[PDB]
UniProtKB/TrEMBL annotation, chain A:
Compartments, as annotated in UniProt: Host nucleus; Host cytoplasm
UniProt keyword list: Eukaryotic host gene expression shutoff by virus, Eukaryotic host transcription shutoff by virus, Host cytoplasm, Host gene expression shutoff by virus, Host nucleus, Host-virus interaction, Inhibition of host RNA polymerase II by virus, Metal-binding, Nucleotide-binding, Nucleotidyltransferase, Phosphoprotein, RNA-directed RNA polymerase, Transferase, Viral RNA replication, Viral transcription
Residues binding Mg(2+) 2: G291, D432
Family annotation (Pfam families): Flu_PB1
Descriptive protein name: RNA-directed RNA polymerase catalytic subunit
Residues involved in CTP binding: R226, T294, K295, W296, N297, G398
Automatic annotation (TrEMBL), chain C:
Native source organism of the sequence: Influenza B virus
The protein's name: Polymerase acidic protein
GO MF assignments: endonuclease activity; hydrolase activity; metal ion binding; RNA binding
Modifications made to the protein after synthesis: Phosphorylated on serines and threonines by host kinases, including human casein kinase II.
Cofactor: Mn(2+)
From TrEMBL, chain E:
All residue ranges annotated as the Influenza RNA polymerase PB2 middle domain in the record: 108-200
Top-level division of the source organism's lineage: Viruses
Ranges where the Influenza RNA polymerase PB2 second domain occurs: 39-107
Annotated family: Belongs to the influenza viruses PB2 family.
Organism (species): Influenza B virus (B/Memphis/13/2003)
Subunit structure as annotated in this protein's UniProt entry: Influenza RNA polymerase is composed of three subunits: PB1, PB2 and PA. Interacts (via N-terminus) with PB1 (via C-terminus). Interacts with nucleoprotein NP (via N-terminus).
Protein name: Polymerase basic protein 2
Full-length numbering of the shown residues: 1 to 200 of 770
Chain's role: Plays an essential role in transcription initiation and cap-stealing mechanism, in which cellular capped pre-mRNAs are used to generate primers for viral transcription. Recognizes and binds a wide range of cap structures of target pre-RNAs which are subsequently cleaved after 10-13 nucleotides by the viral protein PA. Plays a role in the initiation of the viral genome replication and modulates the activity of the ribonucleoprotein (RNP) complex.
Lineage: Viruses, Riboviria, Orthornavirae, Negarnaviricota, Polyploviricotina
Amino acid sequence: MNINPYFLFIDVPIQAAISTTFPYTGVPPYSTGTGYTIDTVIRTHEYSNKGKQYISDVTGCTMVDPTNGPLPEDNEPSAYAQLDCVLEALDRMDEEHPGLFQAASQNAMETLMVTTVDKLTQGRQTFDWTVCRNQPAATALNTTITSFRLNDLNGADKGGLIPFCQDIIDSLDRPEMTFFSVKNIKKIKRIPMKVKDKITKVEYIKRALSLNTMTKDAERGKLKRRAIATAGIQIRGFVLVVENLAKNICENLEQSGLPVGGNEKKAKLSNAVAKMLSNCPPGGISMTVTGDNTKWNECLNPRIFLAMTERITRDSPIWFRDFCSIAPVLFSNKIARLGKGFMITSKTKRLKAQIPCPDLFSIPLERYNEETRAKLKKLKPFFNEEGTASLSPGMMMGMFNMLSTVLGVAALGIKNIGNKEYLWDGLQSSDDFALFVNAKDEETCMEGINDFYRTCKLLGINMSKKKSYCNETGMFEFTSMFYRDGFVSNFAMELPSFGVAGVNESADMAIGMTIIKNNMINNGMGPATAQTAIQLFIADYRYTYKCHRGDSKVEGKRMKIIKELWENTKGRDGLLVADGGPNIYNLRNLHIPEIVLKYNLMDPEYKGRLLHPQNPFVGHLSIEGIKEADKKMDYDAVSGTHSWRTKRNEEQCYAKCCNLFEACFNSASYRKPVGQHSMLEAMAHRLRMDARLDYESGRMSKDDFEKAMAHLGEIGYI
Amino acid sequence: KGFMITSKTKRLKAQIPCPDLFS
Amino acid sequence: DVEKGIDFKLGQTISRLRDISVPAGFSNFEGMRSYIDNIDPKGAIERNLARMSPLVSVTPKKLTWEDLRPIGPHIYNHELPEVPYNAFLLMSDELGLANMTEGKSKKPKTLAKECLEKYSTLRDQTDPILIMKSEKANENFLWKLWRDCVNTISNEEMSNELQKTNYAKWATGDGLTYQKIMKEVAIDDETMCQEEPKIPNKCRVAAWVQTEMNLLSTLTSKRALDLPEIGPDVAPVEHVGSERRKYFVNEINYCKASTVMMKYVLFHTSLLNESNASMGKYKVIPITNRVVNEKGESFDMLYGLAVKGQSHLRGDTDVVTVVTFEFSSTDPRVDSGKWPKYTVFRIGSLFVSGREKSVYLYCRVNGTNKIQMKWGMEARRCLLQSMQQMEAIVEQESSIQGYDMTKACFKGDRVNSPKTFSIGTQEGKLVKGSFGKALRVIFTKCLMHYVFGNAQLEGFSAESRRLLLLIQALKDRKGPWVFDLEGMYSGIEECISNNPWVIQSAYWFNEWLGFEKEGSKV
Amino acid sequence: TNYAKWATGDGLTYQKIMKEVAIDDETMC
Amino acid sequence: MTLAKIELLKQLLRDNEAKTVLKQTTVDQYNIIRKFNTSRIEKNPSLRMKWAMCSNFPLALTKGDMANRIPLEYKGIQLKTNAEDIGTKGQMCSIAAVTWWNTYGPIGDTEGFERVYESFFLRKMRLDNATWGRITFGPVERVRKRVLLNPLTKEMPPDEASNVIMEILFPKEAGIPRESTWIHRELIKEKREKLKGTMI
């Protein structure tokens, strides 16, 4: 007999056993990204090559404009979006909703006038032009703030995001641009120093418009690799504001799957399918198109997004309309950086060398491989001398998720073309759409599907005819969630979440148990599965921190001490799993931290030692993560010896200033301080008061008081 | 001193001493 | 100042960029703003559609059973080579040098030392009998490296680092690397070309994959998978959960796939620990496992040794080379197509109960990275994937009739027959299989999804799910329609290149599709 | 200096190895 | 420590960057200043934690007098080191010292946990005294609803919650109590009395 796992589907529906199909247990694919970036640029320009090709006179880089371009005559992807059709869809959406555009725009403006510059510190890695690399958002923002100070640019000290965006827009006009660059001076040692460097206006414009690239290695279910783009800090404010506006608009739209996540999305899915089933005529058919859009960002022109921003803010202050239209302008004239370049080697001499991108065309193309040969022969027209590709048309993945979703919902909501005897409506979310078409027969259902496909092709949207299919309503999939006959199996993909959280013992344990309980609540993880997950997690947790049961004969550094503690203390049911104690957690008490769980079972000496008011292993500065576990997940833990932190792997200026302010005003670490005065004088007054109180209480000597007073005296606030 | 053997593909050389002329 | 309002005016460069970033047909952003604010479209979509060419459409075609065809026909073709064994460690061929131990847990070096000490004949074997040197590896290098491994393991000192440190450098091929030069010379030189991409080979259906799938999914008297205790169960729900958990582990624990999974997890944990502790020194690592028999005897099993190279790597994607020597009882000459990557010896023979059987050493050089190295210790999640689905299955049964069936589905009761799935086939006759056997099959499927996992497997699964869901819709008579079937088929079949699990998955998919086609008549 | 190393061919020199490996390698002649 | 505070302040001001930033950024702007951290977040916490647990002294101990309670090496086992630190400016230590502290060392006060962690112990009380019943294996109809995950002593909006917390455990910096402390005066006094006598 020859076994066959697929035969399981003979006796079980695929959706029921869908979890086993996905290989979400092996090693996810991982990676030069220059080839992929060049290919992406090539495809983006190829789809829009028939547009209007001109040369930007502000930067000198070639630009291709597909908007209002020739209507496609083939199924191939098309970025030729007609502006009038986009405005028609927007107008239909506006008519179908009561002043939604006005409310969303006003709320976006109000929350923008309240936003601070420091909000730009959130997010992921960002392109830094002072070094032309990818740096953490906080560091990039700090460096750009520092550089702006030299060229007479200010507004960061002014607080709100409005002055920062205003002086960012101003910076594009300064005849020069001075900043600090890293200089790895040789002395042999390579020591980094700060060198005051300057660049011209064109170079600065190119740097600001440049989009850095990286390989999307983390992907799990795709063989071919995609490139993710990181933008600079000079686009983050505008992109953030437009994204917030689009989120405000799309949240009300019942057709939008974002930004709601979790059981809310399932609720929306089931409610929508039930609605469409209810709305079907008598004996008619409601067909569901399971769609998976491709080239969702290589066909969306930023000019269409500029038009959408202008139409959305039809009635708003001129200043806000201008401000929110900057992001589409910056994206419509963007430039793409190109990885690290190809590598050429000779095997007859065992020699290899990576060729930096600026030197791509310094070599005869007859030496690159034929594929890269064609890639470069096609990329030559748009190649910048500095080593960047002029990429005007299209968008990089991840920038305008909300705005693209709003455009998709606009396409969905037309609901009819030519008053044909059918209707359509659906769910759209960031490159994944599920459509429903109701008619009186299958033929009319596909007439409607074809009409919707054509309408999508009029906005740059090109549904994938290879990754999509159609069937009867009541069975489909949306964003990897499967619906069949009312049964929505949360596809079990949260399996790679049972490892230790890697923050500390107690916190890792709390996070793991909360993860188990949340999975039980949401994904339908059965009680036996939850018990086995507890078992496996406890095994991994004991192994990773070298703390097994004290009785067990395992050897280790901390294990000897655990063994000692095992008999040095009588009460053996109160020890923690980090102290070789017996596991006590079960399904009924996953919501209780174990320290409180075992509080009764502990011994007075043990609880006194572990729960000491002061612990050298516990520090105030270590409390930052006690609320949210990095997605920010809330976990409940208990102060104790096991609440420690791991070793670390104008910087010092800001860091130590903030640290000292926190140490002076202990309330600052919890809630935002309030005051319209310099930090120095606040600290001086507080320290003077504290010194006087310490002396009056006898905690400080008289010589100590005099010294303190002198210092505080010198400072100038006594 | 013996002899010298060499692999061109790996670009490696080594000296075979006189006592090891038959190994 | 409240009579002024906010001031935010655009400069010169940004204003010009806005002016030139207007759609076609416009000449200034003021023009576009006025056009958007004033012009009203009242059927522009229909006007554009009324002229767009009728050569663009989704091409809606109804999908029937006949349209679905076997995926990846090239595997059937015999002109292509048989797929080789590219997994990290042997799975159905591991030979366990088993030593009974009181239960004490000891360092892997001492355990391997003692295991070899018990088997003096294999420990002191020094004259190999080359059965096959695969294509490139050198027999002298591998044999000398293995001898150094055995000497280091059996040495009195607790140190587990290679005492040569120079022969291994060429045995592992660390020195066989190119030397990087600066860009200028490469530009000037004409012979410094770019390496052509190396595409995977297009292979055929092997036979060892099916045999291993069968063998890893059978009960064995030896059990290794053990799990930590949990707190007392006081609620009825956790009592039911405990009963189900016991019924499951009583089945999974004794399947050989569980032992293989534990061996992989332990090996990768030890590899990560050695790499972190030791960075730039060659190390010796036994492939250790712990196995408890039904009588409670905690045997320690040595499955081979491995030399770890220099793992001094700042990044994670950086590769570290390791050479594996594995004890086995299988002579490769029985099927030489399965072992084209392995250089093997014949280091002796052993008696298990009186039936003498040979003992060979499979030697092979390989490379890993911190990512796969970590996922090795996260391979235990297969167990969870095995339980979840079965849990759901059982729960479905419980939904039908009120009481709990976990005893009924597994063993049956006086009112309900034991649950049987369709598991295999023979001579074109499909065969049923107990609930436990189906659980074993699912667990082995998950384990293989891990071990043979790479980009090809992901691209195959995530794209054949389309056909799986289409077949599911067809079986429910939803009359699914498709737009470009050949596109989906090409997408799927551009992933069946050289992964043994991918080729066997394609083969089983074709066979099951044939079965569904023949059974659709009703 | 770095460029002259490859220009003059001095950098294209074969690497010396221990006699053990050379005897154990069958491709060295 | 206040003298140490003033000395640290003087040393920090000796540099011109500190002088110009402190005299420039108002108290309100402090938030922005705090958020300019490196953000060099670990890419894989699991691997980092695994590696750290195997290191000689991964624990980052805060400088203080606690270390003298424990030798730098106990029973031939290394616990803590006197080498200086740059990331935290403290000392280094190993989980061995943590386990020893859980075994021996100073004995603290058990009173604080009776009331400080009132919510957790109330959770445990509600679990322990709960009464279980039968299990119905039939299908269950479930509706998606906006539910409060955990019980609250007195539900209030976030701003009022923050103001109440400050009025409870931050006696200083309580300018001009708003029209929220009088509403929650009973909660203020109850929590104030309960948390008094602690050292957390």
